[PDB]
């Protein structure tokens, strides 16, 4: 519909809003929208906050890539608790039949910590 | 790049005279005109090969990919 | 003049308009995307 | 074999495929393919 | 070495270009933008505010580019040659500092990232600023590179020095059929783009503007400014004892018609017919809307109370109307060089940035109160969390406006395109000669060849011999070798300075006496009405030479009217000249020898008062002497060096003064095409298409210009041994003859490198691309197509490729756009092939292939091919003086002639150019070159000087040859001597581009376009050539009536139409589909482009009924 086109043209500004902020590259925003698109049709966006569902939808796309981004870097911009946005993440994954998923591998997070930590120029031996 | 192994117009070889013509300039400071007459380049078609040879091989080599 | 069917002056203002074939106005694929760069002649015929 | 080398570190990297595109010993992200061993046949004119 | 001031004033021209180079105008503009001209932006867009919750405020205190305030180190930056191999932008981030209202207490937070400014090379913010061939060797960047150009995402671009007419000044105009006009455009820096006109309808002065609904005659708009007594009007405009009272006398009685007579009644007649701008409140007084109508007009001068100084600026604007009606010889042209304002990069990138910066903090404003319209979300709400969503419109705004060179502004609402170009790395000076050029505005006077021509007021301002031809013939021009563009300083203190020197004021002088005296004009505005100007102006320069005022001023003082001028507006041309006091100059060669010692540079020369900058307007009054042997006791401003009227790209011509004048504008257009060397890092870079020569040589007849830009440190082309004569008839129309044995020794073997690239794209459904390769058959891995593809998929560096022969294998998935199914069922074979095939008609080699990643993690592949070739016939050579030539034949060595010693010439050119082309340079370049070989020393051919002739035949007679270089030689076909004498010697022949290996085309029957079903335009689109309308009329003049039908429908556009007979219009395979009987049909054939006319003409309501006869039975 025109109202259904207008509710995703607005919802396209939301995904490009946080991805400009957290340095999410552009091949995840476009990958994130189909997860929003199937959750749009299946009556998941009604009632809940607009800005609370799109970050939970984006974290599905950031988990599948196996990238260094946590979950609390979404919530600290939004100034809510981790457990608020985490609870509506759990009601997304089991409702919408997401079976295969990567694990939160902690070995990913070591390599990304060092660069903004501003340690010594021998940054390989610390890794 | 490096000096051409033969002259363009007549045909004789100039590859063993580029280091010699320089060594006749570092030691025994000497005219550019009287150097390469002693060296053996008589006619005026071989003398342009060493007068005007820009030697870009010493500046290309400092960008070697092997540190 | 008369004596032809379409010789009335009624047929000189638009009441029906024909649509051309798509051979005239072909859907050129620029392949800058998996979307088709549709030419300006159909998108006018749809706003009508 | 004698696989990919680095830009200024100049260290021979044999990276396992679809894993990474950086090099070791240095953080530089430009990997030059090194020359083959196979004979190539030229003329001399 | 007894130095003297007669022939050694040249030695301070290196003292100019050492401290102050050749890319002054680009480097010193952006460096003034970064340092100072950012702080004048945030100080005019500070204090972002909200109306809801009025105790919130965020203010920008200061702004910085580069380093922080915590670490305060230099930086760590992606190097420029590391940045062009990854399609990234070379940029540095903008840092600001802020304080704002968090809540209970305000908080001041530093170093907020809001964007990334691109920075041009060799600026003081990039890492290449003052390096010493060891830091710069680590960064594998060339020492001899000019710098001054962005490397935004790959390609490297350069903002060009635009120019337009002088803003904030008036120009007089004439026309016969239209009357005359008076344009006066004014652009104050805040929203204002306004031009006013002073027009004459049938003998009456008016004043129109594009915010006033009609015109107003000027007797209203001077009583509106206080000048009311109606004798004061004529006393200002006309003067006394003149015919100007008679021409102007019509406009006086229109005060009697409109019956106004007083300054109170004068205003409201304007604003009665003003076009009312929508104020949304409209407090219109009918008393103040006219008092501001004398504020939004002629925005040069603003008023406080008196309206007085604005009045007699309108009176001086309408006096030069009346004088133009008295004789139309007093008019001015808008092509004089004093009426042009050059404007640089950094003072034009600032018009873009403050558009982007105000667009930043009014999207960031409305994102705040969208949260602050909440009851709970007003206490703990912090604003810097949501700053980074808006930061991306600064970076992507700047990088999109540099790549696609069109700048979409809002404040002036103007859409200049073409403002950036990609620089050409064809040759060394092809990329340096672009950095000093001028791109004009084409104000749509396409009929008039006035501005297409060249003005005499251009001697040494900007170059005279470099200008293109063809479509762009006089609107593209180049700076000369000695040139500096001024900068505006301030007009408040110099207005206070001129009162001290003895000028009166505008508010005291009687209007009877302002025409009897002269008048100081400050930026076109009269303020003082000086008397005895020549004591006033000569005391002004003694403040300037000794250094009380800045040096970028002009004291132009004409005498056609009674006015003296000052100009401090900046962005206008100048050059320096040494002051001559009287019949003895201020040369003082004890100062000049102390320059060579190295403590007294060029900058200290103008600090003392030995030299100063003159623009084109200050050359109205001065009387520049050429040489020191020409000093008169009325003679100022000795010319410092006379060959500086030619830039660094026209400068390489040897003996330009002997040569003809159109044979210097033919070489600048081709010196930018001659192949050669590029830089020192040229085997490291990956560019789109880079020509190289194997063995280049520096020229024999040099110039002082080529050693001041270090051209001969990496030259282009090599000097052959020309024996100018006719030979075998293959050299008739300036073609030329070279020998086969010299080409095999390596005379002119070029080399051509060509990038090509791919990108491995990551899709929506999490599918990559793969580089699997070398599918096998029958005990062997390689196919014919994969002999040079390697094990890893990327083609193997070091071995050749032929036609066919995939060299980058690539597979792309088949579910390219389907929705991600969150499972794992059927994904094992989905990759269809899409390889990269080497086309081209010759086998070329693979030089180097690298793989890396771009700014966002999406891999890159950039393989660079390589082939070298030899100059067979068709390959276009030149002469460095402008004599093009197709190589006509390649004969053997033994058929070439030979002198007594055995010297076979390299190249023979015919004698039949020198009478028509009048190139006496090549006849001198050959004498000054041969004598340099025999003496072992290179010789100079400069402009307006150079090595003489009579001292050069003395060397040429000692060694044993002829006194005119014209030796005698035998023949190689017949054996005996030649009955004439042959002019023999070495001439520098640079090789050009435009070779025939990539111009031979051959299309038999190929691709066809879709809407027209004709052959496809473009050699890369597989060709087929256009038999036009100029060539169609040439055929019918022969009377030939069967190949005209064959060349225009058979071999081009044939198509078989079956058309119905009655109600005749075409249908498909066997139908009529409008009389559905399918009975009356005739098979014929017509062009396809008339099948599609008969359906376009049918789609609008026009019916082309066809009526047929049979051919036979007349
Ligand atoms: Zn020789
Ligand atoms: Zn490394
Ligand atoms: Zn019919």
Curated annotation (Swiss-Prot), chain A:
One MF annotation (Gene Ontology) recorded for this entry: RNA polymerase III general transcription initiation factor activity
Keywords: Activator, Metal-binding, Nucleus, Phosphoprotein, Repeat, Transcription, Transcription regulation, Zinc, Zinc-finger
Organism superkingdom: Eukaryota
GO cellular component labels: nucleoplasm; nucleus; transcription factor TFIIIB complex; transcription preinitiation complex
Sequence repeat ranges per the UniProt record: 18-94
Coiled-coil zones: none
Main location: nucleus
Signal peptide: none
GO terms, biological process: DNA-templated transcription initiation; DNA-templated transcription open complex formation; regulation of transcription by RNA polymerase III; RNA polymerase III preinitiation complex assembly; transcription by RNA polymerase III
Subunit and interaction comment: TFIIIB comprises the TATA-binding protein (TBP), the B-related factor (BRF) and the B' component (TFC5).
Protein role: General activator of RNA polymerase III transcription. Interacts with TBP. Binds to Pol III subunit C34 and to the TAU135 component of TFIIIC.
Family as reported in the entry's similarity comment: Belongs to the TFIIB family.
Miscellaneous comment text of the record: Present with 4330 molecules/cell in log phase SD medium.
Protein name: Transcription factor IIIB 70 kDa subunit
Organism (species): Saccharomyces cerevisiae (strain ATCC 204508 / S288c) (Baker's yeast)
Residues included from the entire protein: 73 to 199 of 596
From Swiss-Prot, chain B:
Gene3D superfamilies: Homeodomain-like (1.10.10.60)
One GO location term (cellular component): RNA polymerase I complex
GO MF term list: DNA binding; DNA-directed RNA polymerase activity; zinc ion binding
Pfam families named in the record: RNA_pol_N
Residue(s) of cross-link: Glycyl lysine isopeptide (Lys-Gly) (interchain with G-Cter in ubiquitin): 59
PROSITE patterns tied to this protein: RNA_POL_N_8KD
Subcellular location: Nucleus, Nucleolus
Keywords annotated in UniProt: DNA-directed RNA polymerase, Isopeptide bond, Metal-binding, Nucleus, Ribosome biogenesis, Transcription, Ubl conjugation, Zinc
Binding positions for Zn(2+) per the UniProt entry: 7, 10, 45-46
Listed InterPro entries: RNA_pol_su_RPB10, RNA_pol_suN_Zn-BS, RPABC5/Rpb10
Repressor recorded as keyword: no
GO biological process, one term: nucleolar large rRNA transcription by RNA polymerase I
Other comment: Present with 5300 molecules/cell in log phase SD medium.
Function field: DNA-dependent RNA polymerases catalyze the transcription of DNA into RNA using the four ribonucleoside triphosphates as substrates. Common component of RNA polymerases I, II and III which synthesize ribosomal RNA precursors, mRNA precursors and many functional non-coding RNAs, and a small RNAs, such as 5S rRNA and tRNAs, respectively. Pol II is the central component of the basal RNA polymerase II transcription machinery. Pols are composed of mobile elements that move relative to each other. In Pol II, RBP10 is part of the core element with the central large cleft.
NCBIfam families: PRK04016.1
Family: Belongs to the archaeal Rpo10/eukaryotic RPB10 RNA polymerase subunit family.
Name this protein carries in UniProt: DNA-directed RNA polymerases I, II, and III subunit RPABC5
Organism: Saccharomyces cerevisiae (strain ATCC 204508 / S288c) (Baker's yeast)
UniProtKB/Swiss-Prot annotation, chain C:
Location(s), subcellular: Nucleus
Subunit record text: Component of the RNA polymerase III (Pol III) complex consisting of 17 subunits.
Additional facts recorded: Present with 6020 molecules/cell in log phase SD medium.
Functional summary from the UniProt entry: DNA-dependent RNA polymerase catalyzes the transcription of DNA into RNA using the four ribonucleoside triphosphates as substrates. Largest and catalytic core component of RNA polymerase III which synthesizes small RNAs, such as 5S rRNA and tRNAs. Forms the polymerase active center together with the second largest subunit. A single-stranded DNA template strand of the promoter is positioned within the central active site cleft of Pol III.
Membership in a protein family: Belongs to the RNA polymerase beta' chain family.
Name of this protein: DNA-directed RNA polymerase III subunit RPC1
Taxonomic lineage of the native organism: Eukaryota, Fungi, Dikarya, Ascomycota, Saccharomycotina
Name of the gene: RPO31
Curated annotation (Swiss-Prot), chain D:
Processing after translation: The N-terminus is blocked.
Subcellular location: Nucleus, Nucleolus; Peroxisome
Residues the entry annotates as binding Zn(2+): 6, 9, 23, 26
Main location: nucleus
Zinc fingers classed as C4-type: ranges: 6-26
GO molecular function (one): DNA-directed RNA polymerase activity
Highest taxon of source: Eukaryota
Any one annotated GO CC term: peroxisome
A biological process term (GO) from this entry: transcription by RNA polymerase II
Keyword terms, alphabetized: DNA-directed RNA polymerase, Metal-binding, Nucleus, Peroxisome, Ribosome biogenesis, Transcription, Zinc, Zinc-finger
Coiled-coil positions: none
Subunit structure: Component of the RNA polymerase I (Pol I), RNA polymerase II (Pol II) and RNA polymerase III (Pol III) complexes. Component of the RNA polymerase I (Pol I) complex consisting of 14 subunits: RPA135, RPA190, RPC40, RPA14, RPB5, RPO26, RPA43, RPB8, RPA12, RPB10, RPC19, RPC10, RPA49 and RPA34. The complex is composed of a horseshoe-shaped core containing ten subunits (RPA135, RPA190, RPB5, RPO26, RPB8, RPB10, RPC10, RPA12, RPC19 and RPC40) where RPA135 and RPA190 form the DNA-binding cleft.
Additional record remark: Present with 907 molecules/cell in log phase SD medium.
Family statement: Belongs to the archaeal Rpo12/eukaryotic RPC10 RNA polymerase subunit family.
Protein name per UniProt: DNA-directed RNA polymerases I, II, and III subunit RPABC4
Species in which this protein is naturally found: Saccharomyces cerevisiae (strain ATCC 204508 / S288c) (Baker's yeast)
Gene: RPC10
